[PDB]
């Protein structure tokens, strides 16, 4: 159950930041669950294999490249290649993201989310998983720093012993 939380500036409100949590079980191809939040409400949606397949063949592209672009947009793996823009109507619950280049827009994808009655639990789950990853990363880095120090010390020792060996 891989997860990824990203920050997107919705076109409707430029200054305000919206947060986008995408989760997939095995791989992004099989489908994913998306949750868009802003702190006061959450909108949840699903994309199964059939829907992504329909999107891929309807656009008439190779499925692998479509998945690559979808990951570069949703998962926030974009480089300097080119920019994306997202749109989301609150009274229609119709999210859609496109790739903008040279004033030319490509409607890369469109999902239909739906309002969830209880936003407090989703927000709390987001932050709790976030702090869990925080703590796990701290633990891993602290553990590996000790291995770093051990490696440096052992290298110093063995270098000294090689110096003695060559001198003798």
């Amino acid at each position: 159950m891989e997860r990824k939380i990203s920050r997107i500036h919705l076109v409707s409100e430029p200054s305000i930041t919206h947060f986008l949590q995408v989760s997939w079980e095995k791989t992004l191809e099989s489908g994913f669950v998306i949750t868009l939040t802003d702190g006061h409400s959450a909108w949840t949606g699903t994309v199964s294999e059939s829907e992504i397949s329909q999107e891929a063949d309807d656009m008439a592209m190779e499925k692998g490249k479509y998945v690559g672009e979808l990951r570069k947009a949703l998962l926030s793996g974009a480089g300097p290649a080119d920019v994306y823009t997202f749109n989301f109507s609150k009274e229609s619950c119709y999210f859609f993201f496109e790739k903008n280049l040279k004033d030319v827009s490509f409607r890369l994808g469109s999902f239909n989310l739906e309002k969830v009655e209880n936003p407090a639990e989703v927000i709390r789950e987001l932050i709790c998983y976030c702090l869990d990853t925080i703590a796990e990363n701290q633990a891993k880095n602290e553990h590996l720093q000790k291995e770093n120090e051990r490696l440096l010390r052992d290298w110093n020792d063995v270098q000294g012993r090689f110096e003695k060996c060559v001198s003798a």
């Binding site: 672009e69 496109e98 030319v104 490509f106 409607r107």
Partner: protein, 100 residues
């Protein structure tokens, strides 16, 4: 072709390509010029020809920033005046100049 059917054809062949005719034509010119000027150096473009009835469909496929770009030139047999002034008279002029 002028700037009234360009948008129609662009939207028909690309259901999610919301661009003005100017940008589409600029992209087409950029795609076509390197091939015409120099023989297939870029090699990014793909061309196909279909002859149905008296018309000709020239399909051009390209990768606009890695995304599909389809175009279809619909050509009808040129009038006698156009073919004349484009091929016949110029060639006679060239022959006369070479003889001189």
């Amino acid at each position: 072709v002028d700037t009234s059917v360009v948008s129609q054809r662009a939207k028909e062949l690309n259901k999610r390509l919301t661009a003005p005719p100017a940008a589409f034509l600029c992209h087409l010119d950029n795609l076509l010029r390197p091939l015409l000027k120099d023989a297939a150096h870029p090699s990014e473009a793909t061309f196909s020809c279909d002859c149905v009835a008296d018309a000709l469909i020239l399909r051009v496929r390209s990768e606009l920033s890695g995304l599909p770009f389809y175009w279809n030139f619909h050509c009808m047999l040129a009038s006698p005046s156009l073919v004349s002034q484009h091929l016949i008279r110029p060639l006679m002029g060239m022959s006369l100049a070479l003889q001189c």
